[PDB]
Amino acid sequence: FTVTGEGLEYTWGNHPPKRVWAQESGEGNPHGWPHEVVVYYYNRYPLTTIIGLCTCVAIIMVSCVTSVWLLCRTRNLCITPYKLAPNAQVPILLALLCC
Amino acid sequence: YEHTAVMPNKVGIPYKALVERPGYAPVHLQIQLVNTRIIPSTNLEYITCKYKTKVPSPVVKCCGATQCTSKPHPDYQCQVFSGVYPFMYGGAYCFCDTENTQMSEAYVERSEECSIDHAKAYKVHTGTVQAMVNITYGSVSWRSADVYVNGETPAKIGDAKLIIGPLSSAWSPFDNKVVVYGHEVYNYDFPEYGTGKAGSFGDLQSRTSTSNDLYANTNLKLQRPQAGIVHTPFTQVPSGFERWKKDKGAPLNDVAPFGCSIALEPLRAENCAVGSIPISIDIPDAAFTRISETPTVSDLECKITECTYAFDFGGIATVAYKSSKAGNCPIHSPSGVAVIKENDVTLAESGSFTFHFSTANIHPAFKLQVCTSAVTCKGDCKPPKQHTESFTSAISATAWSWIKVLVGGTSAFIVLGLIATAVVALVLFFHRH
């Protein structure tokens, strides 16, 4: 059996009931490698770690991908200027090339 | 002087707090619950226990019959019996012909364990709550004190005008209809008091032991005496409540959550430590002193030696300091994060010494007070390996505040540049004309 440090009742036979906190079980290193700290933020709590992990990975991925789309938006917007050049005339020394 | 507070329900754990005043030297306390006593306004309703069944002398003649009456007993029966023809040893069969005379009059009554042992069937009403504490304040030692929950109770011990709560939480696991044998005790959904439950549980359907009102039915039915045998063959119900006394279950005390128990006579629930208590206590303002006469603080610094997050105050740290002059001065923990073993220490000249404390933290960065001078000792990283901790979120570590700001700043900055881009382009397009 297992329990929190909350103790728990028990008595088989004329044995009086006793109740003992369950602890001395950390089971995790707060800081190792990032993979180590990952196993930690997996184990430092059994489950609250896990729910935090799933929700956090979800939200960070969605934030990053939103940033990515906004990046692409801005990039094509930056593309839009040079459509002057379709005139096929003098160059204005930018990153893209037509020497 | 009176100071009040709201203390959380801490049945076992103590509670110190330094109390100060401008121009006055401070003083600590130490409150510690001793009992919690939850007394409903209950009562018993009726009792039940094993029955008994006796038989008077069944009538007999040579011929003819006597008559069966309403011999007043619970479930009592009687019936004539004709042509009985029963013999007696070395007799003459008690007749010369058809006897016809046998009433088999019956009787039901109560057992004798009833005296020693019977049901205890109760209606349990609102009632009260109270509790015992121990105060070891200031200069005061163990002063264990008991009082009722009500937020009114004016109680003075020494100089402590106690006013208690009442408790935030407002419930104990009880029930109006709860019964009990022996030490055990059971919520009987309802003891069917007036209603004879076929004797299935209301085997003794009576208000009291001495209340000889048996509104119960053993369903006593007689059978015909026969075979020349003088007897009263019959049937009735087995002691049903006893039949359950085979099917007894888990007493509520054994099921009571919050690892707490019950008292027999008042149904005093015993120390289910839940809630907070707005207490109010007067203190001796004479027990105060001045503030200027005191050996003064100076040269503040504390060394965070080490703590490992464990139950016991498993962390030691020291101070390095120089005093105005030697003496003593309290060290209160306004932030009880690292739950200090200490609450008041002597302050010798250059009081540069240590203390002990537990926090659940992997590491804090916090501080607390000493000698009316709050000093900062952040709290180093803590190893892992009954009682509380700090435990809320103070277990913060380096990588946490590192990566959180990492990701937040990265996302913010990139999206900011992204939004900038648009108007950055548009401005010169406007400039075109």
Side-chain angles (χ1 to χ4, degrees), chain A residues 5 21 24 31 44 67 74, chain B residues 362 381 385-386 400 414 418 421:
Chain A
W21 59 101
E24 315 109 79
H31 21 54
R44 82 219 177 85
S67 140
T74 57
Chain B
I362 272 66
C381 181
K385 120 272 177 55
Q386 183 78 304
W400 318 11
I414 60 196
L418 277 21
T421 56

Side-chain angles (χ1 to χ4, degrees), chain B residues 102-122:
Chain B
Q102 163 65 15
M103 282 330 101
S104 294
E105 68 299 302
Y107 200 142
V108 182
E109 65 282 355
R110 316 176 158 188
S111 60
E112 314 315 306
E113 115 280 27
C114 287
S115 57
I116 347 279
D117 338 288
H118 42 287
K120 280 78 206 179
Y122 287 70

Side-chain angles (χ1 to χ4, degrees), chain A residues 7 10 16 20-21 31 35 50 53 60-61 70 73 87 94:
Chain A
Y10 45 85
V20 173
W21 59 101
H31 21 54
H35 61 75
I50 304 317
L53 285 170
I60 64 185
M61 298 340 168
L70 268 308
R73 160 93 286 100
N87 54 36
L94 205 46

Side-chain angles (χ1 to χ4, degrees), chain A:
Chain A
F1 284 116
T2 186
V3 68
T4 130
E6 80 110 18
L8 211 129
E9 173 272 321
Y10 45 85
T11 158
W12 183 275
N14 318 262
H15 295 343
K18 267 70 59 179
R19 295 97 349 194
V20 173
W21 59 101
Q23 220 338 283
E24 315 109 79
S25 43
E27 288 113 357
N29 167 32
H31 21 54
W33 280 122
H35 61 75
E36 191 293 300
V37 314
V38 152
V39 324
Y40 180 70
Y41 212 100
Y42 190 106
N43 61 41
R44 82 219 177 85
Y45 329 131
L47 158 124
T48 307
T49 39
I50 304 317
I51 61 185
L53 285 170
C54 65
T55 188
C56 82
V57 299
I59 59 191
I60 64 185
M61 298 340 168
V62 305
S63 61
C64 89
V65 300
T66 50
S67 140
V68 167
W69 183 93
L70 268 308
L71 267 147
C72 92
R73 160 93 286 100
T74 57
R75 173 264 342 163
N76 56 69
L77 298 180
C78 108
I79 299 307
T80 52
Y82 351 120
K83 308 319 136 303
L84 33 97
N87 54 36
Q89 318 301 343
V90 125
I92 325 291
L93 60 135
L94 205 46
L96 205 37
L97 137 141
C98 267
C99 202

